[PDB]
UniProtKB/Swiss-Prot annotation:
Superkingdom as given in the UniProt entry: Archaea
Protein name, entry field: A-type ATP synthase subunit A
NCBIfam families per record: intein_Cterm, intein_Nterm, PRK04192.1
GO CC annotations, alphabetized: plasma membrane
EC numbers for this chain: 7.1.2.2, 3.1.-.-
Summary of the function given for this chain in its UniProt record: Component of the A-type ATP synthase that produces ATP from ADP in the presence of a proton gradient across the membrane. The A chain is the catalytic subunit.
GO MF annotations in UniProt: ATP binding; endonuclease activity; proton-transporting ATP synthase activity, rotational mechanism; proton-transporting ATPase activity, rotational mechanism
Catalysed reactions listed for this entry: ATP + H2O + 4 H(+)(in) = ADP + phosphate + 5 H(+)(out)
Keyword ATP-binding: yes
Note: The intein interrupts the ATP-binding site.
Subunit: Has multiple subunits with at least A(3), B(3), C, D, E, F, H, I and proteolipid K(x).
Length: 508
């Protein structure tokens, strides 16, 4: 073993035709054959990765004379109907642009540019580039969690935010119908690009993909969702070596898009031991370490991100070890899908007592500045509400509802509303399949004002049975189905008037 270095350098190729592509853990097209891993390097057999014959339209964005550093965008190629693919000087390369393509059509092998480094080396630049998957793509700076990744799902966006660049986790195997939140996240999050790692996929869980996935429309555009997605399959008779590798391959394609200025979401998908602890906590850590929002390389000042959502399919129902206990230490957000919520058909079945996100403080300020100054104070009060509900329910189990004073009945009432009116969301409703930021905070105020007003009326000796059947209530329940946000907002003044009436009819 004369040679050295730990690896052959498992490169990935990064250029046009990533999107719509379906690869495996090392980057070869659909329906492919067998590799081998280890301490040392690895071997292969055959495959290509981005077409060498496909002709791509290249628009130059720089003239001969321009000084460039690694990361600068020298050209643009429209890849799909959605993504403009941005062509960057590979990292490590700075100089004078001495020669540059004229707007036209080229294959990826062509030299679109040439750069004179300061030693004097002319360096040849094509529309694609290579990177060692095991090595984190560099950037200028890694910014603090700060901008939320807007999911359009109320419980997530309000109670358990994901930061752009953050890391979340989520139970079970992705491609299954006990949850569709997985899918919902992938299509609604305001990332531009999605990197999916479908993983361990079984028996006809690959046929779920190749058949349906290219038929999926992207709700923001009505174009294939695939046209802003890279797909990375981890099936059963593939080697352990192309599974261990995959997340790295994936996160690297991820880094490549954020380097463009994109926000990308990356979704991973363990199954019954995603490969076959020890120090293997580090191997996972350093995967998740590679998530982040960054000032990208470039001479312009450009921010991109890779936020990671990781699915946690355990050995089963136990959710205690191995992969499960370790992953939760690393991640900053857990959305706990709870089969008992699912059985009561409370969807999304995210348990509000046991999920958690450490990015609330991080993101409150985006919410306050751009959407509502009252955001954080509100989610807080809502949660306090729901926490109280949790406790009263324990007791009411033991002693029944008759024991309860009005005040308490008022709280179970409003909690209940909070649960059915806000936490519950209709993934299948044409309006409620997505709840924009401005809508979440309005709905929130409506409920919380109802609450404010409920207690007050109670403190004023109004019967709760009166409030319970107050008309505005039934409208509040339907709220989520209203697309016109200010029709929703009017429920506040409406709640007020109905309540005023109720003070009158009891006078005092």
């Amino acid at each position: 073993e004369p040679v050295v270095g730990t690896g052959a350098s498992l490169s990935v190729e990064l250029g046009p035709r990533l999107l719509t592509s379906i690869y495996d853990g090392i980057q070869r097209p659909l329906e492919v054959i067998r590799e081998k891993t280890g301490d040392f390097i690895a071997r292969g057999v055959t495959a290509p990765a981005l077409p060498r014959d496909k002709k791509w339209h290249f628009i130059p964005k720089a003239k001969v004379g321009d000084k460039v550093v690694g990361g600068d965008i020298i050209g643009e190629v429209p890849e799909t109907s959605i993504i403009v693919h941005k062509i960057m000087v590979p990292p490590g390369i700075e100089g004078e642009i001495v020669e540059i393509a004229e707007e036209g059509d080229y294959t990826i092998e062509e030299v679109i540019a040439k750069v004179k480094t300061p030693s004097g080396e002319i360096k040849e630049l094509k529309m694609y580039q290579r990177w060692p998957v095991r090595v984190k793509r560099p950037y200028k700076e890694k910014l603090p969690p700060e901008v939320p990744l807007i999911t359009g799902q109320r419980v997530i966006d309000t109670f358990f935010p994901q930061a752009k660049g953050g890391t979340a986790a989520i139970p079970g195997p992705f491609g299954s119908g006990k949850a569709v939140t997985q899918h919902q996240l992938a299509k609604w999050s305001d990332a531009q690009v999605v990197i999916y790692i479908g993983c361990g996929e079984r028996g006809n869980e690959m046929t779920d993909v190749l058949e349906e996935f290219p038929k999926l429309k992207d709700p923001k555009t009505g174009k294939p969702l695939m046209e802003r997605t890279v797909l990375i399959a981890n099936t059963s008779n593939m080697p352990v070596a192309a599974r261990e590798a995959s997340i790295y391959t994936g996160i690297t394609i991820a880094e490549y898009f954020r380097d463009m200025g994109y926000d990308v979401a990356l979704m991973a998908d363990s199954t019954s031991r995603w490969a076959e602890p020890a120090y293997l906590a580090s191997k996972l850590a350093e995967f998740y370490e590679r998530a982040g929002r960054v000032v990208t390389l470039g001479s312009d000042y450009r921010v991109g991100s890779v936020s990671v959502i990781g699915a946690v399919s355990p050995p089963g129902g136990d959710f205690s070890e191995p992969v499960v206990q370790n992953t939760l230490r690393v991640v900053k957000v857990f959305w706990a899908l709870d089969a008992d919520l699912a059985r009561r058909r409370h969807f999304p079945a995210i348990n509000w007592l046991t999920s958690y996100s450490l990015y609330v403080d991080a993101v409150k300020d985006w919410w306050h500045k751009n959407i509502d100054p009252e955001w954080k104070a509100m989610r807080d009060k809502a949660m306090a509400l729901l926490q109280k509900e949790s406790e009263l329910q324990e007791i009411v189990r033991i002693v029944g509802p008759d024991a309860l004073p009005e005040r308490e009945r008022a709280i179970l009432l409003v909690a209940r509303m909070l649960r059915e009116d806000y936490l519950q969301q209709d993934a299948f409703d044409e309006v409620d399949t997505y709840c924009p930021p401005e809508k979440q905070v309005t709905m929130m105020r409506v409920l919380l004002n109802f609450y404010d007003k409920t207690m007050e009326a109670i403190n004023r000796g109004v019967p709760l049975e009166e409030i319970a059947k107050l008309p505005v209530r039934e409208e509040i329940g339907r709220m989520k189905f209203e697309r016109d946000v200010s029709k929703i907002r009017s429920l506040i003044d409406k709640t007020n008037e109905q309540f005023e009436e109720l003070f009158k009819k009891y006078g005092a």
